[PDB]
Design a binder for this molecule. Sequence first.
Ligand code: CLA
Ligand code: CLA
Ligand code: CLA
Ligand code: CLA
Ligand SMILES: CC(/C=C/C=C(C)/C=C/[C@@]12O[C@]1(C)C[C@@H](O)CC2(C)C)=C\C=C\C=C(C)\C=C\C=C(C)\C=C\[C@@]12O[C@]1(C)C[C@@H](O)CC2(C)C
Ligand SMILES: CC(=C/C=C\C=C(C)\C=C\C=C(C)\C=C\[C@@]12O[C@]1(C)C[C@@H](O)CC2(C)C)/C=C/C=C(C)/C=C/[C@@]12O[C@]1(C)C[C@@H](O)CC2(C)C
Lengths: 152, 42, 197, 203
Amino acid sequence: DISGLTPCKDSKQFAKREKQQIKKLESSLKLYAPESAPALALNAQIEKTKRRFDNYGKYGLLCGSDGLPHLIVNGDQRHWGEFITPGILFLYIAGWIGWVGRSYLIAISGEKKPAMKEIIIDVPLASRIIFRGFIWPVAAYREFLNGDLIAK
Amino acid sequence: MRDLKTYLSVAPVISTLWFAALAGLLIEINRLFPDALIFPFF
Amino acid sequence: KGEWLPGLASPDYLTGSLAGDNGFDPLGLAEDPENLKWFVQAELVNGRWAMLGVAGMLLPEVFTKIGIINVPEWYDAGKEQYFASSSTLFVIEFILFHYVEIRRWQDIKNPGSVNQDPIFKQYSLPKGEVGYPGGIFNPLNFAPTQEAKEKELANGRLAMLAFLGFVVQHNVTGKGPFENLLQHLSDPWHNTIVQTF
Amino acid sequence: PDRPIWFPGSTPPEWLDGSLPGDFGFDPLGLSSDPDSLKWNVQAEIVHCRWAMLGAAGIFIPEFLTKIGILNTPSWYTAGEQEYFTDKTTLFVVELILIGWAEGRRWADIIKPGSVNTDPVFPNNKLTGTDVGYPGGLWFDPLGWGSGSPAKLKELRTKEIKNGRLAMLAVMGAWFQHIYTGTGPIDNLFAHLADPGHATIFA
Ligand code: CLA
Ligand code: CLA
Ligand code: CLA
Ligand code: CLA
Ligand SMILES: CC(/C=C/C=C(C)/C=C/[C@@]12O[C@]1(C)C[C@@H](O)CC2(C)C)=C\C=C\C=C(C)\C=C\C=C(C)\C=C\[C@@]12O[C@]1(C)C[C@@H](O)CC2(C)C
Ligand SMILES: CC(=C/C=C\C=C(C)\C=C\C=C(C)\C=C\[C@@]12O[C@]1(C)C[C@@H](O)CC2(C)C)/C=C/C=C(C)/C=C/[C@@]12O[C@]1(C)C[C@@H](O)CC2(C)C
């Protein structure tokens, strides 16, 4: 479809790889007794492998010639969930962490010896500060508009 | 009680508690959802 | 005024002068006056639109369930064919809303500056507060008393919550709002959210 | 000062005076050195005592009545397994909301002693309690036995606290007996009373 790639449900090397993995698991599975716990664990492993391959086929990834899935970071609307959405989630989380840390630093900067507050954290103030990161983009945008973000 | 609480707020103890909680949450999330390569909710 | 959570002191910046004041700001957003003014205007607009939206997606469904006019559902209202293509309507809406929202933004930046009509110079809006233009926008001449503003703010907040509920409970369950309410009323103890999944 | 203590001949801790009801100077771990910790521990102990008294009564009355032919209630351990008119999740959610309202009110009372003494809806109704943990009023004290002389109040509070401690011990004993042995507490009591010597934990 894109750059000469084949949909992963159509490709045959994907099914071949699944067959090799299942055969490799069954080779070790044949050793133990049917009622033994290792047999149950290996059967669970086989079921997990089958479910993983079924989900990979369902999600619409594109395996290459070698039979392994490939990721598209172009921004094509058909492949937004591979890169763009996790990227947005990661950016949100990182902004939360950074905003919380900067807010705590500014809050403890007032005291006479902030070093003792850094080496020995105070819990109530940090607990109050932490939950303000849920709205970090709005606060950051407003502070940038006002002019409090950059020191002078 | 005051001194014990002050000691419990030192950097290594808080760090190990935070990282243990984070590791436990990540392990439980990966157990409930075994494999994940793309974001399929949308 | 009132306290949103009993036993908790109201924030110092909220003095109760603003209409619809209950001291609800646990995350410290309105710690600066300019942010307070901007968020007041934003809360007015977001909610003045939400009331109309909620009415538009609620009343036709009720009147259709009664059996007077057959109207498509709010989710399926976009598929129906109209006298013009959606692109032309979108362009017209974009142009008109561009004009009116730029006028409102210029009003917000410099109060009392865009009151004058640009074409017929003899007409102008009477002086007033930001966000309540009055004049032609108040054809029935209703006094902008504080109680009316409080009622409007409460209704807007309720409408915003109702719109969020509509969206979420249609995403989770493929049926519409009124049929969801009827299904819940058929058997209250076996039709809640916790019963599903 | 001269009150009996848990360990005779010992020295009670300095932060335990004796003004609090049911005070015996037992705190070897120093868990309540801070006064705020003392208030929180007192409130937690009172709540635990009341809840465990209710639990012990609700466990041990139906079982005893089932030993006789009066009642036919099932075992307390298997009560949650049975089927009711609704799913357990719905009942849990409704109970969560209902208890959460009251617990929020109690928390607000604890944080600020006098902010929830008035009925929010009708301002006429009021609560007459003046101590944290003792709401009073017509709702929680209709008979008026609460308010009175300080000595009688202290005696009643000590009675309640001791009963609550015994009830907590009772509930934990019932739980552990049921998980270990595998029979109702009344059955265990009767079996032990039949043969005091051999029918014990060592069996
Ligand atoms: C408190 C939060 C904090 C924040 C907001 C920043 C912010 C920034 N860092 Mg600094 N940094 C930090 C902590 C922080 N740093 C620490 C602890 C270290 C030592 C490991 C460094 C070492 C460092 C280097 C070597 C560089 C930066 C650079 C940068 C800039 C670019 C962003 C980036 O490249 O990240 C880089 C991030 C890291 C290397 C690690 C930081 C993440 C740590 C693990 C978490 C901080 C969280 C903190 C413990 C929270 C406590 C608060 C709580 C008690 C309430 C940006 C100004 C880059 C630069 O100069 O750009 C201009 C760069 O070259 N930082
Ligand atoms: C259920 C919780 C509980 C709690 C919170 C309290 C709380 C309190 N007790 Mg009470 N007490 C209890 C149960 C409890 N008690 C029981 C069961 C008994 C009977 C043995 C007593 C008998 C008692 C005496 C004799 C005295 C007190 C006193 C006090 C006060 C000061 C001591 C303190 O700091 O405790 C804080 C306690 C804790 C934070 C609880 C948790 C501690 C660890 C984490 C628990 C370990 C679990 C346990 C050992 C396992 C048992 C297994 C079970 C099957 C038996 C404070 C109000 C003193 C006083 O001044 O009276 C007013 C005092 O003299 N108590
Ligand atoms: C402290 C908290 C407490 C709690 C959480 C419980 C919890 C419970 N009680 Mg217990 N109970 C308590 C204290 C408590 N009890 C006290 C202090 C007493 C002494 C009065 C009792 C005496 C008691 C009785 C006599 C019965 C229960 C029953 C129940 C169980 C389900 C019924 C229900 O909860 O409705 C609230 C329950 C009651 C207060 C009594 C009303 C009886 C309810 C409505 C159930 C009747 C249903 C019927 C027996 C079952 C089949 C129906 C039929 C059509 C087929 C549940 C385990 C019922 C049961 O055993 O079900 C398994 C029951 O029959 N309790
Ligand atoms: C609260 C009062 C209480 C009472 C009346 C009983 C009563 C009984 N228990 Mg024990 N038990 C208790 C607490 C209690 N227990 C607690 C808290 C636990 C959890 C550790 C246990 C765990 C337990 C097990 C696992 C077993 C018993 C057994 C029994 C019976 C035989 C006695 C025995 O072998 O010693 C065993 C005793 C214990 C391990 C510890 C009990 C000591 C606590 C601190 C008692 C304090 C209560 C009070 C001071 C004593 C008199 C009470 C009176 C005033 C009402 C007897 C009917 C056995 C049975 O099934 O009989 C056939 C049995 O197998 N008990
Ligand atoms: C505008 C709006 C909805 C508008 C809907 C419209 C136009 C609908 C239009 C249509 O339906 C019609 C009419 C007919 C259909 O045929 C077509 C469409 C197009 C579908 C909703 C806003 C909805 C807005 C919502 C829900 C906002 C919620 C905000 C909350 C809860 C904030 C909380 C806090 O910020 C405080 C207050 C203080 C802080 O300290 C703490 C936190 C928690 C951060
Ligand atoms: C709240 C509670 C406590 C119990 C039991 C609680 C106990 C035993 C607590 C013990 C605490 C101890 C010993 C503390 C000791 C010390 O802290 C001191 C005091 C001082 C320090 O210096 C030293 C140390 C040692 C640390 C129990 C509540 C039970 C309830 C509601 C039960 C309800 C139900 O049964 C019903 C009615 C009916 C059933 O169908 C269902 C369930 C749901 C099962």
